[PDB]
Amino acid sequence: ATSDDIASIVNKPVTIYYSIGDGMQFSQWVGYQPMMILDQLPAPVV
Amino acid sequence: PSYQQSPRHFVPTGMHSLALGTNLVEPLHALRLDAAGTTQHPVGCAPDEMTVSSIASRYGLIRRVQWKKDHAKGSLLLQLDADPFVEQRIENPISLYWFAPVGVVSSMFMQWRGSLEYRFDIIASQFHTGRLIVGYVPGLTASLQLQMDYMKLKSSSYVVFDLQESNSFTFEVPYVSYRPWWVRKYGGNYLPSTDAPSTLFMYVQVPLIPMEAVSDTIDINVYVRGGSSFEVCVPVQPSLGLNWNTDFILRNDEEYRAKTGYAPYYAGVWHSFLVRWQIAQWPTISVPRGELAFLRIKGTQPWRTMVWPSGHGYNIGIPTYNAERARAQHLYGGGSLTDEKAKQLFVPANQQGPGKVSNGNPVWEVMRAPL
Amino acid sequence: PSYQQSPRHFVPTGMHSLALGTNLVEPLHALRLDAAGTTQHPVGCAPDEMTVSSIASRYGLIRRVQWKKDHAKGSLLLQLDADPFVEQRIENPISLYWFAPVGVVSSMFMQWRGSLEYRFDIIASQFHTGRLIVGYVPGLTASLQLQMDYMKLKSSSYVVFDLQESNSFTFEVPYVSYRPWWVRKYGGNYLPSTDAPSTLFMYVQVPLIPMEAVSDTIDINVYVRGGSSFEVCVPVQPSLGLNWNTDFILRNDEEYRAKTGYAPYYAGVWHSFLVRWQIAQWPTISVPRGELAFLRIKGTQPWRTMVWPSGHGYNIGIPTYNAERARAQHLYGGGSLTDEKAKQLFVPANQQGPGKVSNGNPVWEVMRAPL
Amino acid sequence: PSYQQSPRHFVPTGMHSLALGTNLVEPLHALRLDAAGTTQHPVGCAPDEMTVSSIASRYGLIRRVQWKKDHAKGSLLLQLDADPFVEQRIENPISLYWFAPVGVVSSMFMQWRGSLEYRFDIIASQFHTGRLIVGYVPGLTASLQLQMDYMKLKSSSYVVFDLQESNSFTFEVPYVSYRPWWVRKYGGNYLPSTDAPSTLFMYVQVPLIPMEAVSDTIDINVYVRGGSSFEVCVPVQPSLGLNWNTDFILRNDEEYRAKTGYAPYYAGVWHSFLVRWQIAQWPTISVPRGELAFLRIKGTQPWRTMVWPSGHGYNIGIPTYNAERARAQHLYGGGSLTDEKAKQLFVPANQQGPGKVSNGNPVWEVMRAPL
Amino acid sequence: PSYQQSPRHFVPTGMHSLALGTNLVEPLHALRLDAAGTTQHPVGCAPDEMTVSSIASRYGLIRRVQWKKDHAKGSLLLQLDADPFVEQRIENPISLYWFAPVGVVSSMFMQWRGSLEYRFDIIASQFHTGRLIVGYVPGLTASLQLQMDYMKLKSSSYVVFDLQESNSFTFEVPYVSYRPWWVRKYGGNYLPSTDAPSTLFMYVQVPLIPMEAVSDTIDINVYVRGGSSFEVCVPVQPSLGLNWNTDFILRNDEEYRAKTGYAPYYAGVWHSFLVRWQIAQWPTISVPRGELAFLRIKGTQPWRTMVWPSGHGYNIGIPTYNAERARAQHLYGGGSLTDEKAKQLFVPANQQGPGKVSNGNPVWEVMRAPL
Amino acid sequence: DKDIDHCMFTFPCLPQGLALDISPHEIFNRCRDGIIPLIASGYRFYRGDLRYKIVFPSNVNSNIWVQHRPDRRLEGWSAAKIVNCVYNHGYASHIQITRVNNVIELEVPFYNATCYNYLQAFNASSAASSYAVSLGEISVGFQ
């Protein structure tokens, strides 16, 4: 895009996804780290 | 040859499927150089491990239970829930928790079923003699979390153990429920969506009678491993997050911000109108009848003072030299932006300067003043 | 599996073919409930009839020829053309015609060829004795439509018939032409695009000598059926239309109308400018130098009076209270729409009213007045 | 059944290929009624002829060479080039040329190779005795087009012929070149892109000694046919055009025109601004400092007088009543279109009239006047 | 037949893959005339050569090492790196380098591995007697590039050679590294992304003892060829460029230019506003509080003088007759473009002229003046 | 104010890489030459096809015609770059429509009367040798 038309596209979201696609093979096991429980997160008080 | 036979009649769609992860040929644009190329694993690089039951067959240490000499012949040691979601709290404004591997790999699914082999490793010498029930009651609610003791426990399924020359036993927690599966205890960040199906209990049936050469207190470690019949089905939003980034951001509304897609801004000009992100929007300040509002934050100069409806459907924030020109008496007092009084109070265009932008969405301060 | 093989490289088009009506699989969106479903015909509902030669093997009555006693031994009875397009006129400002079925099913094609069996059914008793040539000359133009009689006919192919105890004969008109086919005589509504290839004739070789107990006059009916070798090829615009709707609309230009896509209109407002369909266009009135024009037809009130260029590329028609405010002296006299004289003559906005639209494209009356 | 298998992943393109003319199935939208239909050729309609070598095996008459009695024993008769492109000039401001069929069907290709059998038909009686070399030198440039005679010819390949009782011989011009093919001599209308590979020559080795009963002069006709090994490869823009339409249009720049896509124009109104095609553009008149420009050609009246920049990026031409109002003194003198002086000089809107357009792009006359 | 079966359900993409260069059928639009056509190679035109190992099996001369008589029994001759990237510097503000063919064809890849046969060709007579170690130490960093001599070399792998009746030997540099491959030493123009895996050394073990009839000094040439096990894998941006075009353009910021997509410009009019490319943008001059700025470069006249914000979001440069009208005192002094003072200082529209554009993006000169 | 026939730009077609045109273009200022002329430096001659896949911007909508012209020679290494300047009949042609997809693709064949063609940078020594460097000349023009 040139400089004139890219000004309209400012503050537009660009989303990237991902996945492994059958080539991925994980190695040696390691235990999990400490976890956070999600419902314990606070509500947005209004 | 002319190909006059009438052609196909399809439907376009923009994207291949996402939840499909199985016997399904997926076409892409590989940045590999070869079309038949696949990443490979040479003779040492063939990896050892990936399977839900490969995770669910690993013990995770989940509870330290102190077991003293003078604990009586009915004292409770744990009432912990017979799900894989075992609560182990570490001592931030959010808290972090250990889990069994079967607990986390249950927390990446909706539903679970099957046995749960909890291993009690009772660390003692052969001189200590003990005895303790590991009971299991199916279906006790929160109000029935009380009224519990070993005498009402032994009605249900229970295993009495003697702590002697062998010191370790892996009890297999049954799966007893009305439902073929069982919903995740925690779910997404969502206050509805259920406690445990069943509860484990561990009471001291006969108290520790130690010899006078050894200690009065004994550690009991409680491991959790998914049973041999354990299996999970539906892949949903996980209920657990990592602690690589424990930062959390609240979203209370009393503090100020620019609207989404309008920060960062910069001081500049606009031919319809100084005032940009295309003029940056601002939230409508909740002003009742008979007040005024002006802003002071928490070009040629830093613009620490700045809200009125533009007329094009969204608010604008005009920069001022100071809070005096900003201090809203004219506009809330019935004026308009085209007033000569207003145009004198405005900053002229020459103060645009090099126009360095604001750092992100800087939180302004909403000063509310009487009119 | 990742499908990295490089994909197809097509051409889109928006619509399946239209002239193709043959061995060609056509994909659609059926509103039937079943994919293998086809409309069917049970044991009585299997229909009897569809084929060009199924139509071309039907006689159609096409000519009543009176055949009197005192017709002489060379008098003409018909000079009608040896195409299937046989002229039979019924006694509206457009006229309607009978045709043979082979005539119409020839008129749904471009070209025809083959024999044309015309059946002469000569309705008489066995007491009447007659004799008549059915001749056939290939290739007589319009200037050669005259000079015809039986003596110059018998040079060509001809069949002499005796009207006696049998009274009917089906002559088979040959197909004799230079061309393998023959273009339709009439075509679309298009004044170029050809008369008949050949002409039939029927002269009375020996006149009727009736008995004095029977009548002097005899009906001769002339049927037309396509021959056994008849065949048509190219499907074009048909030259014949039904008489379900014999209404016709001329398109003379002296009468007035609104432009296409701008009627119906309604009286309303417009911020650039009372005056809409988005302002409705009007034709440019052909006014020479030194005249004026105003309109009177053939809101709050019916607007029977109303043309000037708007300035946006198309004309507008302004409503007036009467033909007096309309009576164009200012504008053709050198004024403009922004004049105070013009703005006083205009109708104010309050007369928009409920704004019921005009009925279609109502024909105005163009009054042209001297300046 | 639900079809969940992941679908194809293509590339659209808008149009099928154009240069491909071979074993390639081409899909279209046939206006034929039948899908399996193909145009056909019945028993007489199977056509006789199409092939490059079917054209290249036809003699074309290309040169008339006079051959007199008193031509000496070294006189040149033709130095014509040994390509198929043989120059034969017919006596318009462009000139027309005959060619051999192998010349034209070479001129529809880029490259050619192979022999060129030129037939010399030497029209004489058996009483004339002659003798002449047909030589062939490979690779003579333009500077080597001189220095040529039979004595330097006989070093190269040559054929001496005796004109006697047989009078005709077809010499086969060799293909001798460094390159496997040879680029077309003329090419597109493009001044670079090469002369002949080789040159034919024809000298009179022994002069004509006729008998005193026959003529001193003898016609020699020179035909050209492509040889048996002749072949052409690359299909490019042809270098030859027909003489059905020998009209040609120059594109000098001193004459005036409206810009492309803006003629025909018509006098009309425009709300931003009389002045249209949406206002029609006009070329910027190359006026140096201190002049003025107005236009007079080579509504209510014909507008024979008319350039200034509109302000919207393109020039406009304003109509005037005469060349007096047009005669540019105000605008080139520093004025503007919004001046009252300019607005008086303009034509008011009422002179739009019926607005008949100009005929195409009428060439105006650029009058340049001093200021 | 009606084709009611439900059709395919794809995904469009706009372009075929780019990195794929292998067993993959690629559809295109060939400008060849034939669909089965492929460019061919006749009996002499079958080309001799293309393969990475076809390049890596070619010696390239890479180092001239002088080897004198009086070099001592430990003197260094080369410490050059044991990668294919061998530094050979030619004596422009950028410098050019020779490389081995295995060096360049390594520089078109990310990673390399395998042996590196360096050939030492020691040009001497059979009367010279010499002796020299070619050692090889795996893994010496830059700080370990010092401390090197033959006595610490002989711990590692080494080859002692006697310069005698045979004068040439090709040492095979091993590939000794922790990693299966080795990253390119130089990479793209990117200051991070690694030195050599290992280092070659060449010390004079026994010095040259020449005869008194021959010379004291001896050339040693050092060739580099990739070994038999050499192989490269990942195709990345090459680290080497040709010397067909050694021109380079810096991008310092103190000099001026028009913004991208706005040069070349031309003097013209604009209805919102002389001033175009649609008005050409200009960079915002970094002026602090209390200055002014005007431009003088490094229509009817050349416009050597010209910045202010237009009001439509981007700067404009107004042409002036001279630097006096340009010399910014009004606008930086608090004025605006709609001022009568400003409108007098502007150039009127008549000076647009023929409007010849600027040559590219002409670098203006930023004059900064006090206010 | 170009006619519809007018080519918008013409360029010779060759695997050698262009005369490198470095407001510089930050790729040709920064990433010198890429791959294919770096390999093509290592061979004096070549013979074979080329693929192009010309990509057009978004705001254009008009139809695009593309020509191969094997008639055009290459006169020197200068003016062997892209040139901003009519449509022709018998040259090999293709129209890509912008509205369907604004990227044309091409398989431009080998049309030379040669055994192979020069692959290093060409100084135009021999006059006929200019016929033997490019595959031809591709022209892109708009409607």
Q: Is E336 helix (H, G, I), strand (E, B) or coil?
A: coil
A21 reaches C (C-beta below 8 A): yes
- Please tell me which residue of chain A has the smallest CA distance to E279: A4
Among candidate residues C118, C122, C199, the one with its CA nearest the CA of residue C161: C122
Our measurement of the distance from residue E41's CA atom to the centroid of its chain's CA atoms, rounded to an integer in Å, reads 36
Which chain F residue shows the shortest CA-CA distance from E12?
F101
Separation CA E281–CA E260 (nearest Å): 8
The structure tokens 């393969």 sit at: E51
Contact E284 B354 (CB under 8 A): yes
Breaks (C-N over 2.5 A) in chain C follow: 49, 91, 193, 273, 275, 277, 298, 306, 327
- Helical H runs in chain C? 52-56, 101-107, 150-153, 323-326, 340-345
F69: left (phi over 0), alpha (psi -120 to 50) or beta: beta
Distance from chain centroid for Cα C355: 40
The edge-to-edge listing of strands for the beta sheet with E60-67 is E60-67, E218-226, E116-122, E168-173
Q: What is the distance of C-alpha D183 from the center of its chain? A: 18
Contact E259 A2 (CB under 8 A): no
Q: Using CA atoms, how far apart are residues C265 and C284, in angstroms rounded to an integer?
A: 17
Beta bridge partners of B60: B224
Cβ–Cβ contact E2 with C under 8 A: yes
Q: Which chains touch F (3 or more CB pairs under 8 A)?
A: A, D, E
Distance CA C197, CA F89 (A): 44
Nearest CA in chain C to B24: C1
User: How many other CB atoms are found less than 10 A from the CB of residue B261?
Assistant: 12
D252 touches chain E (CB under 8 A): no
Q: Of C13, C14, F101, E10, which Cα lies nearest the Cα of B11?
A: E10
Nearest Cα to Cα of residue E232 among E106, E85, E51, E84: E106
Sign of CA dihedral D257, D261, D266, D271: negative
How far apart, in whole angstroms, are the C-alpha atoms of residue D96 and residue D243?
A: 8
Instruction: List the beta bridge partners of residue F46.
Output: F117
Specify the length of chain F in residues: 143
Which residues fall within 8 angstroms of residue E143, CB to CB, at 6 or more apart?
none
- C264 preceded by cis ω (within 30°)? yes
Give B124-179 as a DSSP string: --TT-EEEEEEEEEE---STTSSS--HHHHTTSEEEEEEESS--EEEEEE----SS
- Rounded to an integer, what distance in angstroms lies between the CA atom of residue B131 and that of residue B72? 12
Q: Closest Cα of chain E to A1: distance in Å?
A: 10
Indicate the pairing of strand E198-209 with strand E76-78.
Answer: antiparallel
Query: Is F132 strand, coil or helix?
Result: helix
Q: Would you list which residues of chain F are within 8 Å, Cβ to Cβ, of chain E?
A: 19-20, 22-24, 26, 29-35, 37-39, 41-43, 45, 47-49, 51, 53, 55, 68, 77, 92-94, 101-110, 115-116, 121
CB pairs under 8 A between B and E: 82
Q: Three-class SS of residue C3?
A: strand
B window 311-370, beta carbon within 8 A of E: 348-350, 352-355
Q: What are phi and psi of C352, to 5 degrees?
A: -65, -45
Answer whether A24 touches F (CB < 8 Å): no
| Residues ≥6 apart with Cβ < 8 Å to C162 | C129, C130, C131
The answer to whether B230 touches B117, Cβ cutoff 8 Å, is no
Chain E residue with the nearest C-alpha to that of A1: E261
Tell me which residue in E2, E20, E28 faces C30 most closely, judged by beta carbons: E2
Q: What three-state secondary structure class fits E123?
A: coil
Distance between A5 CA and the closest CA of chain B, angstroms: 13
Q: State the residue for tokens 């190269």.
A: D156
- Contact at CB, E108 and F41, closer than 8 angstroms: no
Residue pair E175/E114 in contact (Cβ under 8 Å)? The answer is yes
For A27, nearest residue in chain B (alpha carbons): B47
CA C342 to CA B172: how far, in whole Å? 100
User: Which of the residues D4, D5, D8 would you substitute to probe the E interface, choosing the one with the greatest number of E C-beta atoms within 10 Å?
Assistant: D8
* Contact between F65 and F87 (Cβ < 8 Å): yes
Strand segments, DSSP code E, in E123-167 are: 129-138, 157-163
Contact yes or no, E with D (3+ CB pairs under 8 Å): yes
Closest-CA distance, A23 to chain C, in angstroms, reads: 9
C-alpha E167/C-alpha E211 separation (Å) is: 16
Tokens of F112: 């030379």
* Nearest neighbour of C309 by CB, restricted to D31, D36, D268: D268
Query: DSSP string spanning E94-114?
Result: S--EE--HHHHHHHTSSEEES
Q: Rounded distance, CA D198 to CA E316, Å?
A: 65
C27 CA to chain B: closest CA distance, Å? 6
**CA angle at residue F17 from F13 to F22, to 5 degrees?**
115
Chains B and C, touching by 3 or more CB pairs within 8 angstroms: yes
Chains B and D, touching by 3 or more CB pairs within 8 angstroms: yes
Position C305: which residue type? Answer: T
What is the dihedral angle through the alpha carbons of E341, E342, E348, E351, rounded to the nearest 10 degrees?
A: 120
Mapping DSSP onto H, E and C, the string for chain D reads CCCCCCCCCCCCCCCCCCCCCCCCCEECCCCCCCCCCCCCCCCCCCCCCCCHHHHHCCCEEEEEEEECCCCCCCCEEECCECCCCCCEECCCCCCCEECCHHHHHHHCCCEEECCEEEEEEECCCCCCEEEEEEEEEECCCCCCCCCCCHHHHCCCEEEEEEECCCCEEEEEECCCCCCCCEECCCCCCCCCCCCCCEEEEEEEEEEEECCCCCCCCEEEEEEEEECCCCEECCCCCCCCCCCCCCCCCCCCCCCCCCCCCCCCCCCCCCCCCCCCCCCCCCCCCCCCCCEEEEEEECCCCCCCECCEECCCCCEECCCCCCHHHHCCCCCCCCCCCCCHHHHHHCCCHHHHCCCCCCCCCCCEEEEEEEC
Residues from chain F contacting residue D258 (CB–CB below 8 Å): none
- Rounded Cα distance, B184 and B173, in Å: 18
C291 to chain D, minimum CA–CA distance in Å?
11
State how far the Cα of F89 lies from the Cα of D74, in Å rounded to an integer. Answer: 47
Q: Do F23 and E257 touch (CB under 8 A)?
A: yes
After which residues do gaps appear in chain F, with C to N over 2.5 Å?
22, 85
- Count of C-E CB contacts under 8 Å: 39
**Residue B281 CB partners (closer than 8 Å, separation 6+):** B258, B259, B262, B314, B315, B316
- Comparing CA positions, the residue from B221, B142, B135 lying closest to residue B185 is B142
3-state DSSP call for residue C369?
strand
Read off the DSSP letter of residue B356: P
Q: Report yes or no: D202 and D65 within 8 Å, Cβ to Cβ.
A: yes
Contact status, residue E114 vs residue E180, Cβ threshold 8 Å: no
Q: How far is CA D101 from CA D56, D86, E33, in A?
A: 6, 10, 23
| DSSP assignments along C193-252, one per residue | ----SEEEEEEEEEEEE--TTS-S-EEEEEEEEE-TT-EE------S---SS--------
Chain C residue whose CA is closest to A22: C1
How far apart CA B194 and CA E44 sit, in angstroms, is: 83
The answer to whether C23 contacts D29, with C-beta atoms less than 8 Å apart, is no
* Angstrom distance (rounded) from CA F74 to CA F77: 8
C-alpha B129/C-alpha B113 separation (Å) is 36
Q: Which residues of B touch E20 (CB under 8 A)?
A: 30, 32-35
Residue with token string 């013979």: F47
Q: Is D355–C284 a contact, with Cβ atoms under 8 angstroms apart?
A: yes
Angstrom distances, CA of residue C235 to CA of C20, D42, D101: 11, 21, 41
Coil, strand or helix: which one is E326? helix
DSSP 8-class letter at A38: G
Distance CA D163, CA A37 (A): 115
Cβ–Cβ contact B35 with E under 8 A: yes
CA-based nearest distance B269→chain E, Å = 5
Going E101 to E104 to E108 to E109, the CA torsion angle's sign is positive
Give the integer Cα–Cα distance in Å for D55 and F23. Answer: 57
Does the distance separating the beta carbons of F48 and E39 come in below 8 Å?
yes
Closest-CA distance, F95 to chain D, in angstroms, reads 7
B32 Cα distance to chain centroid: 36
Question: Does D10 sit within 8 Å of E10, measured CB to CB?
Answer: yes
Residue C342's Cα: distance from chain center in Å?
49
Q: Is B75 exposed, middle or buried (0-12, 13-18, 19+ CB in 10 A)?
A: middle
Residue at C209: amino acid letter: I
Q: Which residues of C touch E4 (CB under 8 A)?
A: 27-28, 30, 32, 35, 37
Q: Which of B3, B27, B28 sits opposite D25 (nearest CB)?
A: B3
Of B178, E310, C233, residue with least CA distance to D39: C233
Decide if A39 touches B, using CB distance below 8 A: yes
Q: Mind telling me how many Å the CA of F26 is from chain A's nearest CA?
A: 14
Look at A2 and E260 and tell me if their CB atoms are within 8 Å: yes
Instruction: Parse chain E into domains and list their residue ranges.
Output: 1-246, 247-371
- Is the preceding omega at residue B42 within 30 degrees of 0, hence cis? no
Q: Determine the residue of chain E that is closest to A5 in CA distance.
A: E261
Q: Is C19–D32 a contact, with Cβ atoms under 8 angstroms apart?
A: yes
Distance from CA of A37 to the nearest CA of E (A): 39
DSSP-derived pairing of the beta strands C2-3 and B26-27: parallel
Task: Give the count of alpha carbons within 13 A of F87, CB side only.
Answer: 16
Distance CA(C232)–CA(C110), nearest Å, equals: 8
Residues of B within 8 A of D9 (CB-CB) are 16, 27-28
- Residue C261, number of CB atoms within 10 A of its CB: 8
Structural tokens at position B79? 């009432």
Query: How do E218-226 and E231-232 pair as beta strands?
Result: unpaired
Q: Is the minimum CB–CB distance between A28 and chain E shorter than 8 Å?
A: no
Residues 6+ apart with CB under 8 A from B262: A11, B277, B280, B281, B282
Question: Which chains sit next to B, with 3 or more Cβ pairs under 8 A?
Answer: A, C, D, E
Give the residue from C360, C365, C351 showing the smallest Cα distance to C302. C351
**Any idea what the Cα angle at residue D366 is, between residues D362 and D369, rounded to 5°?**
155
Q: Which two tokens stand for residue D76?
A: 């040149």
- Taking the C-alpha atoms of residue D279 and residue C345, their distance in angstroms, rounded to an integer, is 31
As to burial, measured by CB atoms within 10 angstroms (0-12 exposed, 13-18 middle, 19+ buried), residue B272 is: exposed
SS3 B340: helix
Longest C-alpha distance within chain A, in Å?
52
Are A2 and E313 in contact (CB < 8 Å)? no
B48 neighbourhood in chain A, CB within 8 Å: 27-28
A37 touches chain F (CB under 8 A): no
Question: With breaks defined as C to next N over 2.5 Å, after which residues does chain E break?
Answer: 49, 91, 193, 273, 275, 277, 298, 306, 327
Residue that the structure tokens 């370790």 belong to: B168
Contact between B269 and E7 using a beta-carbon 8 Å cutoff: no
